[PDB]
Amino acid sequence: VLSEGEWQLVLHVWAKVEADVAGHGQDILIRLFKSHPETLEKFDRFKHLKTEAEMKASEDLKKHGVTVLTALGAILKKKGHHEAELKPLAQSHATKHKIPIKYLEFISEAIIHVLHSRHPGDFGADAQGAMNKALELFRKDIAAKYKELGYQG
């Protein structure tokens, strides 16, 4: 599992994320969209945005970035005991949104990139390693629920 010390590192950086969720969530989604364009085509509500300027301009994209980080935050503060929060997310993303497990890896890279940008002195190699373990645990449990449903990535 993650140690209690690695969970400390994770949540100490997330409390800073919580001081500007809407800004963090918008940067993360933008980074996902540009680095991996195919993920934007999964969003009927965002599929119209072509440039980074248009993305930055959209209130609705910002609204959805808040939705995602709030849901991720609820999960991370359970420190691994997240069965009830994670189960509905896997179900929706499996059966309704149809999101390949690989795209959950892409958004995980996006989160880490943005956390490094916004919090250097605060997001050293050790905190980077803890956060990547926590995201791999996230991915690992959703993947298990996907397999059960017939979608395995």
Can you say which residues are annotated as belonging to the binding site for nitrite?
Answer: 64
- Contacts within 8 Å (CB) and 24+ apart, 97-105: 97/42, 98/42, 98/151, 99/42, 100/153, 101/139, 101/142, 101/143, 101/146, 101/152, 101/153, 102/153, 103/36, 103/38, 103/39, 103/42, 104/138, 104/139, 104/142, 105/139
The residue among 46, 27, 47, 51 whose CA lies nearest residue 110 is 27
Candidates 8, 16, 43, 133; binder of ligand HEM (CB under 6 A) is 43
| Residue list, annotated binding site | 64, 93
Q: Residue with the closest Cβ to ligand HEM?
A: 92
29 sits near ligand HEM (criterion: CB under 6 A): no
| Residue list, annotated binding site for heme b | 93
The residue among 48, 60, 65 whose CA lies nearest residue 110 is 65
Q: Of 9 and 61, which has the nearer Cβ to ligand HEM?
A: 61
Candidates 2, 16, 34, 42; binder of ligand HEM (CB under 6 A) is 42
Query: How many of the chain's residues bind ligand HEM (CB under 6 A)?
Result: 17
Nearest-approach distance from CB 73 to ligand HEM, in angstroms: 9
Candidates 9, 10, 104, 127; binder of ligand HEM (CB under 6 A) is 104
Residues at the interface with ligand HEM (CB under 6 A): 39, 42-45, 67-68, 71-72, 89, 92-93, 97, 99, 103-104, 107
